[PDB]
């Protein structure tokens, strides 16, 4: 039966996608924590040190988005797998995956914004305090291309939904997988860029402390 | 009074590696 093959290939894909959602939630949580830790570090520096007294790094809260990713990862178990049943289970999975992509894009945007806000805060502190610290400069992160791509995949997955029909199901499924692969590659890119800028700005703050 | 302030670094390379690994392995889930 080709239906066994479709069901098994689909079930295989869902499990891998669940893996990726669990890993994404973990990376987002770790970024959230370190961003907030380094925001606290910067604010502690300002407090210990008139023209700098109002400088304040912001905290990020993406716990709602992280929670949703884990919830979709768990709820995708109900989408696991007769052409009606396959089509309905597939369509069910796509909508949950669309939800997870929308939530990931949101979390990435909030991280981008807070990282850049806190980079500006650190650079303002340096400017106010400025010989030996004057070149210290926090970098900004730009992941808008990746965020845009996630939302576009979330939207374009509507065309992969299912309304001979094994070909149609197979082709619609294959279409969805390629879009999801695209979104996974873009998510990984966005996470690496955030990781790199967070670490650059942590080093910048630590360099400021050492010089002062 | 500032000498101990220390920003932390983040390491999510394990998670990033897994996303790309899933993106690649999803090729095997494709239907002929």
Numbering used by the authors:
A (entry chain A): 918 to 966, 1167 to 1198, 2919 to 2967, 3167 to 3199, 4918 to 4966
B (entry chain B): 1168 to 1199
Give sentences copied directly from the paper behind this entry.
S2 subunit includes heptad repeats 1 and 2 (HR1 and HR2), which mediates viral cellular membrane fusion by forming a 6-helix bundle (6HB). The formation of the 6HB fusion core is a key step in mediating viral entry. Here, we screened a series of 5-helix bundle (5HB) proteins and found an optimal 5HB construct (5HB-H2) with broad-spectrum membrane-fusion inhibition activity. Unlike HR2-based peptides that cannot bind spike in the pre-fusion conformation, 5HB features with the capability of binding to pre-fusion spike.
The other three constructs are truncated ones, including 5HB-H2 with amino acids of HR1 E918-L966 and HR2 D1168-L1203, 5HB-H3 with amino acids of HR1 A924-L966 and HR2 D1168-I1198 and 5HB-H4 with amino acids of HR1 E918-Q954 and HR2 V1176-L1203. In order to learn the basis of the 5HB/S binding, we further solved the crystal structure of the 5HB-H2/HR2P complex at 1.9 Å resolution. In the crystallographic asymmetric unit, one 5HB-H2 bound to a single HR2P peptide in a 1:1 binding mode. 5HB-H2 consisted of 5 α-helices and interacted with HR2P to form a coiled-coil complex. Overall, 5HB-H2 created an extended hydrophobic groove via two of its three central HR1 helices, accommodating HR2P. This groove featured with a series of apolar amino acids from the two adjacent HR1s arranging in an interval way to form a hydrophobic interface. For HR2P, its helical fold would align I1198, L1197, L1193, A1190, L1186, I1183, I1179, V1177, V1176, A1174, I1172 and I1169 almost on one side of the helix, matching the unoccupied groove in 5HB-H2 for strong hydrophobic interactions. In addition to the hydrophobic contacts, we also observed a series of hydrogen-bond interactions that would contribute to the intimate binding between 5HB-H2 and HR2P. Via the structural study, we have shown that 5HB-H2 assembles into the proper five-helical structure and binds viral S via the canonical HR1/HR2 interactions. It is worth noting that the HR2 region recognized by 5HB-H2 in our structure is highly conserved, such that the amino acid sequences are 100% identical among SARS-CoV-2, SARS-CoV and other sarbecoviruses.
